[model samples]
Structure formats: structure tokens, C-alpha cells
Target: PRFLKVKNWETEVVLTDTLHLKSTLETGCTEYICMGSIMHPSQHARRPEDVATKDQLFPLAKEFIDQYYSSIKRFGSKAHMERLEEVNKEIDTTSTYQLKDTELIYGAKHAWRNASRCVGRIQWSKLQVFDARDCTTAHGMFNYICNHVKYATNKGNLRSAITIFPQRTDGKHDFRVWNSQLIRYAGYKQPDGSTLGDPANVQFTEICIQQGWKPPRGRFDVLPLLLQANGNDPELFQIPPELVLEVPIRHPKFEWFKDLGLKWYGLPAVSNMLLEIGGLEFSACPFSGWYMGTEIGVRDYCDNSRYNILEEVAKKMNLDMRKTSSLWKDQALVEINIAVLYSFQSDKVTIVDHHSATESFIKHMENEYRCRGGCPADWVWIVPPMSGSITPVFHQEMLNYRLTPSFEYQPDPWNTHVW
Candidate 1:
């Protein structure tokens, strides 16, 4: 327990109690969910020649739908799937999605993986309708964004963390950032497209921005062994407390932390913040805003680097990613990995709470579904608790809204079917 202490130049890592972060919106601090950090932007449009109008875009969409429909007809017959319905969404005008898009690029700023697992370059641009652009496409795009969030939250097992931007509750900006810690995002890009990235942007905000921080001093507190992941540093990482819904960082020093006390990751309230997966009901959360057609799946399509295994997933699904038109199509196959796992049994769903639990659950679920035996997908373990903090609507509320036609009925009878 005894470690070296510092005088003025003390280091204090501020980890968030993400599991109990009531709602993702409330935690909209300066934090980041994985690579969802905002940075400076540059030459917006790459080449005006590269930009496709609806005239050019519509045909591409039609071709995609046609090929996809044919692929499913030929291969996806056994698996009942929905048509990739094309909705009229607006271009992203709010610039928020663009900002997040740029952040993903800048945070990693790597050629290997240049975007969020879910919000790829193509998808990010599809969200202009939310910016008061009364395009019907906006509504459709909004639906897609909401659906993807819910799918990632409920099925993908992602945690919704707060943001740390210097912004007011009304979405104003005050730009204050600190270099205190690193975040472990649950949802990241894998080789496949169908899978959802763990701990989508929500968790990024909570841990990086919203969580309070204090300087450590007086006595020395040795930092614990934290498993590092994809942030800027390898030494910094998130640690769950002993109690549920109450997670804390390793004390930068011992004395100051002794009074507040260190709680284990399993503590009741803290345990719930263990966001390993995202829920399906994204719209249920009042704070959950919507974006249209801006959702991307799996890895970055623009990345020229090739993953050898992609050939196998593409082969099994009869997809050819070589063609530019086939990019999104190929990615869709990759994204399906999450859907397969989430609905593996079509009845039973599992939610991962903590890191330890997530590590174990991912392996177990993969084994149960032989998920790993096949091609790479967007499957990750950092999801939230399904019944409580993880989901926007609790069990009771989901039930109450079911009676009304406005709310779509989720198939799960455990919470929906009446007594």
C-alpha cells in the first residue's frame, strides 16, 4: 500500500464511475468514448470530384441493395434478415458527427484503422437532416442511427459513458481538456462489419471529461497494474471497483485516497457502470439524440490495408470487396457478426458488466456460438448491464410503453408480455 509521493508535480488519474453514469447525455463531459475525441479539422472536402450527388449516390444505393438482396437470396436464406431499406436522409449539417468523425481519425490518426467501428467515413456524412434540414431522408437516417445505437447498446454490449467537453447542458462548447488518463473503449473496429464496437462514443465522454479529478500529494500511492488499451498511453487504463456501479482509478497517491476509500469493481452501484455492451432501445433514452444514414459498420472501408481473414468472411458470404461499389456490402457482412452473437439463440441475450466479466463473457459467448471459428466481426466485450444502467428503458418502462402503438414491441416476452 505504501508508495512514493510527490510534492507539487503530483499525478492523479481521474477514472469515472461509468457504470452508474445515469444517462449517456448527462455525462457529456470532455471525455472520449474510445477514439471519439474532437480535434482540429482541415480541408473538409477531399475533392469535389469525389463527392457524389444523389443522382450518383442513388444508383450506387440501388446497386448495393440489388446485390445485397441477391446475396441474401443466394446465401442468407437460412438466416431471416431485413432488407437494407434505403431511407432519404440529409447530409450531416450539424457538424457534430463530422467532428466525432474527425476525432476518430485524429485520436488514432493511424492508417491501419482510421475510424470508429460503427461510424465509418461514409456513414458519418449521412447525417445532415438532424441540423434542421427537413429532408425526409433525415427521418429515415434518424431511425437508422437510433436503431444502430440500440443494437450496439443492447446487443453489442457497449457502455454509455459521459463526455468531458467544456460544453453546457444545452450543447454549448467550452473546450477544456486534460491529459490525466487513458480510456479503454469497448467498441472498436474489427475485421468484420456486422459486429458493433464496444463502449461506443458514450463511454468516451464520461471517463475522459465528466468524471472529477483531484491532484494527489502528501503521501505516495503506487499506481496499480492497469491493463492498457487503445488510448494515447499504455500505462493508463480503467479499473472497476469492488462494488457495482462504483468504479475508481488507482490512487496516484495513498494518503488522499484513503479517506474517499477505494471500492472494488463489483460494488453494487459501480458494478452496473461496467459498460460492456450497448442496448437495443436507444430511442428510449431522452438524452439519446438521433442522426441519419451516418452509421458505419466494422472497419474502415477506405483503409487500403488488407486483413487476410477478410477474404474468408467475404468468401463465405459470397462477397467481393475489390469493387468500389461493393465496399459497404462487404462491410455489412463484417457487421453481421454482432447480430449473429446478439441473436445467436434468438432468445437468450447476455450483458457484460465488468472488465473481468467482459473478458470471460466474450470468450464464453464466442465459444457457445462458435463465433470465433468464422470470419472476424465487430464483436467486443465492453457492454453495459442489460436490465439496468445499460439499457435506456428499464424492464417496467419497456412494458408500459408496449401497450401503446407508438413504441415498437421488442420480441422479448420476459419484459414485454403482460402477466
Candidate 2:
């Protein structure tokens, strides 16, 4: 058998009669590669050509198969062609084809990697994929979700994971989760016009109450899941608190910070998102990844629209909050960020600071560029919220574009819209 021509990262292509398998490509000093296999540079150069057309199932499904086969490096192998034919036949009869569990596994990781808004794409290859595609009930969805949370949490050492529910078929029997995230605090609008908890969840919390959920009235009460399965009405199921790890926010230096009673969930699980794999639409796939500190410290706590704890923290620090020119807000933000990162560390929970996250993202972009010519990124989101100009990504120009096998935002399940 003739050996294949190969080239390393540097120098000239050497001619060899025998081949040697590459161990793994290191993204950095310790971090390694994507899951299952190493991505060849050619794979990155290849782009989908027929995506813009208003195509139906076959085109999408067919393209995904090609990608799947391509990724596996059996571009036109017998099994690849045979599987393609079978899928075509299946789709012709059923209007959609079921993904082999392996396909879903590969698809899910690719979706995670392809997510343009994710700053953690460098960790995509390590995703733990769960196939609950056989799930047919809302209660079943909750059980699978619980398992996902438990496994992902891992007693504070977080792992990135996803539990994919059944796919939509014939535009009927649609399985979808109603919550934006699995772990969220209740936001109750007081009669005196103040939000009790996260203002983001105000409407969703009320929805849970309307469907027979008892509002605990606690500021950090974990909202129950509103899961919709098989096109049926959404049902509410309370997520177990033991499975949900909430890190109590405290500062290492400030003793008074612990009494603020601020806490945030360790897992950032997005429950309501459409996972488009190949051409199949998985409506109720819940995916969770670990958090970056600013997600809690800056946006969730400091934003005037959300918890708005910046001024509170500033006053506690005894900074002059009377004027923004005194840089009190800036000082408070750094302390808040430090507290968030410190609490997670003190509790032995997983979290990344904005600096580390942006730095990692920069490495990811460089790796992606070497592999695919460009890395799709939304610069607005890639930059850290608290300190934009100070971050490395702030100076970087990026292109934002949709890539296949992507997680997408669908309309709220409560919204009455004709589809």
C-alpha cells in the first residue's frame, strides 16, 4: 500500500514510504484538541455551498451527512455512500431521518464549536453528549435534565455537557423547553414597583406560577422547569436544589461581603434553544457549559437592569457613590469581579475570570484561523463587559456568521405565533 503524503506544522513536506500518526495538536502548553479526532486543515477550508437556498430536509440532511463523513475522513467510503442512500430512503418516507447516536454526538460537539457567540469554543471537543432523543414526555425530559445537571456539576468541578431531547417531526410532536435556562432565580414585581430577584426572569417566573408553581418568594429561589414535549402543553417540574450548586458570593478581603446574601448557580444551562444538526431540528436540547466570572459579577449583579448591586457594593466599600467621576463605580466593579472569582474558588466551584476567558478566546481565534482561515466571532460579546479596552479581544476584528450544526434562539414557547 502506498503511504499518504503528509506535512507537519512547520518546514517542507517530507516524502516518506511509511506514515506516522500525529499524537495530538496542542492548542497551548497544556490544552489539547477537539473530541474524537484531529481536524485536518482541508476540512476547515471546505464550506457549505448550498445553504442559502430555501431547501427542504434532503438538502440539509445530505449536507450534514457529507460533513459527518468528511469529518470522519471517509469522504466517499462505502459506508458513507451506503448510509447516505439509506438516509435518503428514510427521509423520503418519513420526511426526516433519525440520527445514529454517534451522529448526534458528533453533531452536538460541532454545534458547540460552531457557536459564534461562545468565547469558550476552545473547549468544544471535550463536551459530554447525552442522547435523550428517545424521550417522549415532559417528565422524562426533566429526569434526563437532572442527570445532565448532576453529571455536569460533578460536586463543583464542572463539566461541559448537553442532553438532547427528541427532534421535531412533520411539524408536529414538537419537544421544546420553555425556560431560557435550567437554573434561574424568581423575579417577582413588588406592588411598590421593585423586582425581588433577577429581573430577566420576571415574566417566566409568573408563567411558572400560572401553571401551579408555588413561588417561594425567596430572592434566589430556583425556578421550576417548564418543559414541553410532543407538542403538548408545557408542564412545570421543580429542579432538585441538591443537584443545583449555588455558590454563595463572598469576598476574601471583605468580611461584610458574605452578608450580602448574593449567590449564583454554578452551571449555565440553556434549556430553550433549537439545535440544528444536519437538517434535523432538535427543539428541546438543553446544553450547559461552565461560567465566566463577569457573567455573574458584572452583568448579572452590576447591571442597573438586573440585580444592580454595584452601588450597593460601592457604598459598602465606602467609596463616594455621589459621582461617577470619582471612579467609584469602576473600583466597585473590580471588587465585585474579584469576589465572584474568589467565591467560586473558595467553594471549589468552576469559574473563569474575564481576563483568562478573553486570553483563552484569543488563543482559540488564532488556532481557528490557522485551521479555517477565519474564526467566527461576535466582537461585541467576545470583549469583556467590565474592562473592554483592557482586554485583548477589544483590539481584535472578527467576523460574525452562522455556521451549520449551530444552537439557535427560537421564539418563546409561550408566544402565540403562526409557524
Candidate 3:
């Protein structure tokens, strides 16, 4: 009720008859209590003795209980709800709600379904969950992450998966993977102010170096894993070369394309996101899915901040770079996109083209409407960066809203002051 006293950024105060307005009522013409003068002009003012009365506490507690009950029913079992009620009755909010394996599995799958930015919800149910809550040390986290990589890579047969670790519960320490992804290349800024390798990973590469990792000289060097558990210092673990599956990209038409020395990992496993289920936040959950062709070709390799290889490929294609109307850059981009798709397909690795992915998402929405009654999506994210107008999802209307049991982007661990 104390919080409810505010309406849309404005506070409402009610001073009733029972409220005491007394000071010292002894002797003389001393003006006892001046109501207007006594009240502070600013809402930020606080009195040390002020506290929430029973009338205020009752409504606040009821509101919290209702919300807790709803979330428990949505993501947990009947027993879990009953247990939560018992804890509430005892006035204990700190009691941890343990998720059963089945609940955890379902929650992970449903979280993906609830993700607004994801166009790959059709495969949400296929996610493989790994419960690594017992891993209390950085070394243990390293081992588990390595295993996750191996399982997801699967010798070129990429699989969508997530590995969950201990959450921040009961005032205990939190576990977190410092790297943005389980697999990423190292970037080194040379003395000449040019970066060698993936520029996107420079900051993380520096973190790995400070954590005692000796970075390799090559641009495509894979940085060591940075894992922290129970508020401990991060430990660096080198990924075995064989565990990381990389596909050597080649073009179907161009013979010179293979000489670019370009390759990408078989899987894209994101490690730094928080998985929130029914108000419980898991800070160390790493999830992955198979790559889409354009993600590598257009964004990773062709972006100006990334490899920026469009002009290089254009030069190799013997196109006129001097003329703006040459369309050399566009031509090179198409070949790069085609190469990514062809290489993955030839190696028997799972990959989706932009056209097919968007079409599948359209079917996914229909499936979601039949099963879930409504599907929430972000049209901007659902539309492919390349050939957006050609896709069916481009013309579709979408709704974006908050959903429980979801994966959320959190502040980077190193960037946060608390860490």
C-alpha cells in the first residue's frame, strides 16, 4: 500500500482524523502545529521515525502474494505453489524455490517461446538443458562449458542447447561466465592501431589476457574461457582445438574464395544472458542455437566494425571498385552469403537461409496461435537484414510484450560495479 500511494509518477498522501498533529501543548500563545509549514515541499524528504502501518502493509503483502501465486502456478508444480504459500505464511521471502528437473526443462523451452526477438521459436522445444548447479568452482564451470561446446558442436551436427548453473539465491554468491559467448575469436590491437582478428572480441580478449591467458598471434585465434563461480576470481581455460568445430567457407562459383582463410564456428553459444523464471534469476545460464547464414556473411564478416571483407572480396572478384555504380560490393556480399550457405550444407552442418528461416517463423507463428492462443514477436528482429521485403514475415503484424520464464539481457559482469 505504501508503494500504491503513488499514481503514474505522482504521490498521493491522505492525512486522516486518527493522525497525530501534536507537538508540545503546554502554556502560552505558541502556534502548536502548522500543517502546511510542517509538511516538506519535496517528495524526497524522509522522516527517520516514519514506517508503514498495518493498513499499508496488508495491501502490499496481499499484492505480492497474488503475484507470487500466479507465477508459481505458471512455471511450477502444485507442490511448489503449496510450499511457497507455506513460506509466505511464515513471513519468509528468502526461501529458495527449487525447480524440479521437469520444471527446469519446460521453463527453458518456454523461455525461448517467450523471447520477443527470437524468430526460431519453432525449435524451442528441442533445446537440451544441462543442469550444472552443483559446480561451485571456476574450474568446474570450465569443464561443464567445455562439455556443452562438445555436445553442441557434435562433429558438425550442431544442436541447440543450454547449460544452467547456480543462481543467486539465499544471499549466496552468484556464478557467471565472463565471456559473451562460449566460443569467440581473439582480437589484438597492434602497435600500428590496426586490429588483427575479430574486432568484436577485443575487450573480452583483453580480459582473458589479464586472467593469465597467452593469446596466440593469429587473427582467428580462439580465446580461452573465462569462468567465475561463487564470487571468486575468474579462471582462464583454453578450449581444446578439436572440441571447437569450425567450417572452412568456400564459394560454389569462385575458386579464389577458399584462399581468404575464412572460417566460422559450427555453433553460436551465448553465455552472458540471465535466465529469469518466476522472479528467480539464473546469472550463469549459457544457451545456443545453430547459425543462420547471413549472421556470418553479412554481419560478422562484412560489417565495417567487423572483418569488413566486402571490398577485399570485391577486389578478388575483379570488379570495378572506383565506380560507385559498379555494384561490386553488393555482388561480393551475395557470393559471401551463398558461400556460407553452401559450405555449411556441403559439410552436413545445420544452417538456415534467410528466406527459409523467415518462412519457417511464419509457420511457427501459426503453430503458436493454435497452441498458445497468441504469438508475441518483434517484427524488426524477425525480418532478415538481407532481403527483408521478400520475406512473408516482413508484412506481418507482431505484438511485443513481457512474458514470464524468459531469457533477459543483463549488464555485463565486468561492467557492473558490484562485480
Candidate 4:
């Protein structure tokens, strides 16, 4: 018998024991399987006291302006330096300046690099920044979102992109994408004790229902985009089916798995985050990156509170479920993860495995260290959800700190009435 002990980020521990069933099994060399940790709580604790004050804001404003001037090859020009000084002076004043196209693009790219929790910052310079500052109405914001979906989707060949909208000015609420992501599945909690789709999206789905949006009956229904601008009423816009790429999951070794009817979208576009640049916050910026396989396999699908498919998969594998020591659940989890990777690869979609992603992150850290003094990283988020010890990042020590030109979490649109 072999025992597996793992620790979660928040200090909860789960222990799984697997006994070698070589003598009783029909197969010869059976690897020991053990179930991993449970789903992490969806809501994390907040620190309101950590809010940025004027002392922190001024330095970030200076850094942003300095970088903007440097990127445009205007480092020592008098006019550019004066403009930078003007921007700095406005930090305490309520004055705001329009970012030129070059500054907007550069700031967006740096914001990705400055995101402490993102593992894919290695591709920061390659992000496509779409200028959508002219969009004023909710319908216009929806139109820009659809355009972003079409461009980022690219018919399954996903691209990393961010559509920049108007920044907040004069104490008015800015345009916003109310949805957490541009692409997400709708969740329908039934009268019985069951959920038809993703449990993570149930609250948002209810809000959509209240707003007169019609959701489909299927469990895998793609949600419509909810866009708000100028603190007006939110308007829902459905993405065209052809523009949204989906991958049907099937295990490479198991022929029967094709009947499961499981599928997921190709791109993960975060829409609700606030993009802060040069002391200005753009609440309507929507950005995307190609999906990472474990994001779907380990966390989304196998999480107990979400898809909760561990038991169902174990039954399909026909493993002995009489004892926890049988390790049936773990065996099924590996196959399900494999199915996700195989399906995405078969569909020509870009997805990174945990091992490769960790390696890439290490390289990113090295590059950042050479360029900047140090790289800020949240260790808990940097580590993969599954098989953390096997990866190189398990041994690495990381520092997490607040950085300027960053994407920040803001209050929910409904709660703040910041349309």
C-alpha cells in the first residue's frame, strides 16, 4: 500500500491511500492511483485595507508615463518629457489625458507582464490591443465584444488579444462587460438537488434570467454577453455560433468515451477586470488567452462543486469502487485529463500542459529577473492544481507584490452600479 498526502494553498490537507492490487488484478503492472484535493472555495478572502493610497498611486503613474515615453523613442525629448511631467502633475489633480495608440498598446502589454497571478506572462509582448475607446453605448460595447470574440477565436486557432475601451473620467462610471468571461457556460439549478451546467455561473445565469435573457435547455449552452455603458441598463448580446469554437472531448484510448457528449470553448476571455494604466482605469477592457488543459480537466470538470465527474468517470472505467484504497477515482481523473488534452490537440487548439507551463513560467521568471530587479508571483496560483510536486515550480520560492500598470479586481457591476 502507498499513501499520498497533499496540501492545498489555503492550508487544507487531503490524504489518499492506494494499495497495490497486483495479485487480484487481471493486468500486470498497475500504477497506484489516488484521489487529489477537493474543489477550492470559489470565493477568496478580501483585504480592504490593502487598497492603493495616493502614495502608491503616484509612483505607478510615474512608471507608466516613463514607460510610455520610452516605448515611443521619446525618452529625452523636451516635449515628451514635459508631457510626462504633465501626466505626473495630474496625479493629484482630477485632469486626465487621452492615451495615444502607441501608449495604449504598450500599456496593455506591460499590464499582462505585471499581472502577478498569470502563468502565461511569457507571451506578454505578443498581445494584440484593440482600441475601442470610441464605443459609447451599450450596443457599441457589445459590438466591440463580438468583434473581439471573432478575432480572438480565429476558428479554433485562438489568439491572445485585449480590446481596450474608454477609461473612467470625471467621476462617471465607465463601460463594462458584466460577464466574468466573454465565453462561459450557463448553469441551471433544478428544482431537484441537481445542476444542469456549471455551478460557478449560477448567480450570473440568474441575473441574466432576470434581465429577460433566454438561455438554452442544454447543459453546455454558451452564455450571451452582457454589456453595460454609462451606468445605463445592461443589454445582452448573443455571440454568433460560428464565431465561438468548441472542442468535443474524447479519450484517445477509450472508444466509449465519445458518447459522453462533453465539450468546452476554445478561448478563455476575462471581461470584468479593470485595466489600470497611468493612473487611469479602463473598466471595459476584455482580454483572452488560449485555454490551458488542466484549467478544464482538473479544476473545472473534476471539481466536486462544479462538474463533479470523478465518480461518473470511475464507473465508466469499471474500476472497483468498494474501497477508497482501490484508487479508482484517481485513475479515472488521469484519463479525463488526458481526454481534455487529446481533444484540444485534435481540434488544433492551443493548450499548455502543467509541466510545460511550469517550465515556461520558470523561463519567464528568469527573463523578468534579468530585465526588472525581481518578478512578483503568488506561489499558490503559480503552482498547478494537480501533480504539483512533480513540477519544477514546486521547489521554487516566489515573491508577490503589487505592481503598477496592472489589471485589478474591481467591484461587481451590479453591486457597485458601475455600468
Candidate whose TM-score is highest: 2
Candidate 4, 160-187: lDDT as tens digits: 9999888876434567798999999999
Query: Candidate 1 vs candidate 2: which has greater TM-score?
Result: 2
Error of 4 at 79 (Å): 3.8
Judge candidate 2 against the unseen true structure and give its global Cα lDDT, from 0 to 1: 0.79
How would you encode candidate 1's per-residue C-alpha lDDT over 141-170 as one tens digit per residue?
233333333432343223231221111111
> What is each predicted model's overall lDDT from 0 to 1?
0.23, 0.79, 0.73, 0.76
Best by lDDT: 2
Ranking by TM-score: 2, 4, 3, 1
| CA RMSD per model (angstroms) | 25.4, 9.3, 13.4, 11.6
TM-score of each: 0.21, 0.86, 0.80, 0.83
User: Per model, how many backbone clashes are there?
Assistant: 90, 0, 0, 0
Q: State the lDDT of candidate 3 residue by residue for 1-419, as single tens digits.
A: 12111111111322121101111111111267423222122221212123333343333344433444455565356765665565355334433445557667777887797776788889988999999978889989988988898898888888899999986653236688888988888888889999999999888888788768888768688778888888676778888889988889999989899999899888898988777654456788999999888889999999999988998899899888998798788889989999999999999988999899888987787676555545656676787877777877777766444455667666666764244
Q: What is the lDDT of residue 302 in candidate 1?
A: 14
lDDT of 3 at 292: 83
Error of 1 at 411 (Å): 38
